[PDB]
Point group: D2
Chain length 292, copies 4
């Protein structure tokens, strides 16, 4: 699955900062029950930045195990070095994941030619479907529509997670790609707008804690019932915004613990515990969404 409501799932941890299997199972069961279309395992919200490659691979395998064929699983596979992006992708060849989410190199700011060569190479070393992931605010570089057009000509490059929040990109990329190239929002607060312009779903942070509504909203969207969708959206909007009151996933982990979905809200440095003010803000947002 590469459409509807996809969760960018948190990696829940015990107090030592290591993945908590009971909490992960609970989270995966929740997504199955809720109608979530797929899981992104160890993306940005899953703390890929602070997990090493073995720890990252362990979490992917465990998620796939616990999914037990009931919900598809996409692995986060992004790296700023093309060699390392290839090597991480190779870990999951034959794993049972259905695709990889691969971020534009962060830090090193490659040209458009570099972003093309980076992704072309990654795709050539795998049979797995690739979803491009563009988020200039965290990376310092921006994958432009014309380059996405170029990369969509690659057989196993099948979609983009567009996390700029720049809605003009939906139709700019769409005119350049074939009809089966998938366009996913990576920005919760603009994701219904994104779908209304022709997007096919969202890789969502909000879905962590409001998975039924999110699944519902995206179904309505896909059916063209935007006014109906929009009522759910307005309910969720304080969460769409306030899950980023502090750096993600600091707020969404707290919100998971508060809803009894994970055992602890522990994160790895440089992520720090939610502040008192942030805790009151996310609680207000949860109340507004009717989640308690």
């Amino acid at each position: 699955m590469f459409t509807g409501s996809i969760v960018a799932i948190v990696t829940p941890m015990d107090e030592k900062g290591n993945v908590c299997r009971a909490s992960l199972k609970k989270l995966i069961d929740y997504h199955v029950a809720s109608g979530t279309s797929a899981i992104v395992s160890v993306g940005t919200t899953g703390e890929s930045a602070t997990l090493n490659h073995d720890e990252h691979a362990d979490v992917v395998m465990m998620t796939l195990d616990l999914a037990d064929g009931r919900i598809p699983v996409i692995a986060g596979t992004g790296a700023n070095a093309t060699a390392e992006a290839i090597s991480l992708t190779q870990r999951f060849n034959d794993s049972g994941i259905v695709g990889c989410l691969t971020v534009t190199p962060y830090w090193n700011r490659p040209s458009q030619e570099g972003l093309y060569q980076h992704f072309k190479a990654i795709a050539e070393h795998t049979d797995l479907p690739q979803i491009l992931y563009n988020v200039p605010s965290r990376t310092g570089c921006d994958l432009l529509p014309e380059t996405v057009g170029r990369l969509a000509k690659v057989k196993n490059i099948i979609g983009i997670k567009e996390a700029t929040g720049n809605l003009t990109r939906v139709n700019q990329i769409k005119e350049l790609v074939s009809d089966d190239f998938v366009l996913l929002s990576g920005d919760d607060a603009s994701a219904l707008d994104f779908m209304q312009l022709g997007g096919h779903g969202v890789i969502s942070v909000t879905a962590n804690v409001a998975a039924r509504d999110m699944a519902q909203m995206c179904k309505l969207a896909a059916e063209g019932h935007f006014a109906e969708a929009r009522v759910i959206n307005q309910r969720l909007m304080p969460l769409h915004n306030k899950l980023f009151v502090e750096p993600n996933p600091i707020p969404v982990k707290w919100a998971c613990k508060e809803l009894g979905l994970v055992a602890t809200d522990t994160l790895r440095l440089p992520m720090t515990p939610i502040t008192d003010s942030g805790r009151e803000t996310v609680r207000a947002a949860l109340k507004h969404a009717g989640l308690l």
Copy 2:
């Protein structure tokens, strides 16, 4: 040594992307002869992003060995996970380096408190001097002057490579820190203004190819001879700008190859070969510098 002209040295590579010892030796001899104050080994310009930790450690050791006591060496040790930053620093304990250049976490966008805890933990677990490194354009986060002031109270956090190009930062930081905290520009094009405002030197890309002029410019500025320094700077300005016409270190490695300082201008993906138009911009800048 943490003042004056400090080179962010390229990691010269053969056609296979492997460190070239002979090219490194030439570059180190060049810096010893040209009066460069120190060498930043495997920083951003040294392609830290695309070397793994073993290659990274290898280049630092090789640099230190070749320097043979003639020039101080500072290791790039930044990482986005605090544990990984700490662990990389441990590799360089007792190595003979004089200090570390440690970047603000990139990608994950921590809060100011998170950066505080990041750098505090790194400094705690080493005796080596630590130079903080701010470059929001690549990292998506900005270490603010206030958090710098808090960090400067840590005994072994001794300076900052301020790479924003925002010159108001010089005196915002200076008023918060003790007289002996070192302020270094990480932006070649504004580095002379940075020093005129109170900064102590530069960690420089331009210095890779204009070592002597950079060293003289920085000594003049330290002496308050800004008008004299500026004459040199006006001749180095095209190079200050066009060394970034394509992503650093693409132009500067091409420059080094053109001067005969390195055997090849090879980089690792996602860095790609210089375009023809870049060759001409860079060659023009070199000639304006009087280097060709």
Copy 3:
């Protein structure tokens, strides 16, 4: 009319910089023939900045005369001083114009409270319908959705020309206003996207020289035929972009002269004649739209 394709009509001038009546008549006849819904007289594209209030009023009256009841006419009435915005609006009370387009004060950067008080007062001194006009790039201030919500409660404040190009604003403003509050794009290149999200039309520069297509496109949009609309849009897109290759209305005046629609492309300082390179770019864009 406050929906469909509204032209932000150029004020054509003879070589002395004074309105050319023959060219204006020709332009108005063209819009009638073409199916344009309304004319904005002496907005930004009509050079309100360089016309004095008497000259501005003369052009409005002449346009209304020449329209001869065949096409509705909206007067530009924006001023940065509330007194002067009121006095200009008063000139057109009982003129036969159907509404006023009124820009957020430029230069002085009022708060949201100030923008509220400015527009509330303007609306209180007239019976004419008011369209808010938001274009932060030219004004240095931004009318936020919440303030537009506040102002839509005023009886004669009936719509907004949203010229930010920020598509997220369509649904942000829409949730805050009643169903009959009109939402108009003021950005040609994103205007179909804007309509697709729920907008009701566009105040267009492109419509100056491609009025049939624009009228056609907006009809399709309003009918929900976006794929069909989008084909016209792709035809017009080089014009949407290149009519701003030089400051507006420098390119659209040249394009009008080239199509034989105005006698001359004369503008008032600080607008300068189109450059040779700009002339070749706008000609290419016109050829692409199939206009010759």
Copy 4:
């Protein structure tokens, strides 16, 4: 006089928004006593935006009359139409003012060539010295250093009020212009750094309420006593920032009323009364300055 501390003087108004001669007299006497170098009359801080040309001329004449030869007066004369700028300048010929402060056209966003022709024409039709005025944040256009260099060759274009806060501009401009061209900060918070880099003074909002300290700070900076100047600046810094907590001149007129320098703190729409929270920020800044 075009060096040192120059005040962008408020236009004091009674409760009806009319110039208050008695409050203006007090302010002028205050500047004569406090060693202010000159007075900018009816600039941005003097609410040029909301006075018509007759009121504008009236305030300038009244200021000049009250100054009575004791302090030089510079008129704000900027306008967005070249004809109107020229025509406003003619009003001040033979008035006794020493020069004009003329803003880059706001709103209409001319090209660099257009700004060149704008200022060239203004300078042509007067013998009065002209100070260019760059503030992109209010105008939406940026006079670049290159266009400044071209303009500085005009005999009576003698300086620039650089109000961007971008300190790299100081030496980009200085290298292009002759030694006698005057560079003035129009950004209070970065004005000392601006002078330390080579600027000759400031056209200041802070000077309205901290005239003596501003004059001393600027004399120290001119003498190269930057450390001494900076002590004063650190005490003026909260005022440098919080005089812009609400749109200028709202905070500074409230400040002037609080010190008893003006009878009322009344402004013209779209400026609105200071909020209660602004009162407290500003009162705190005044106390930190030692003024209350």
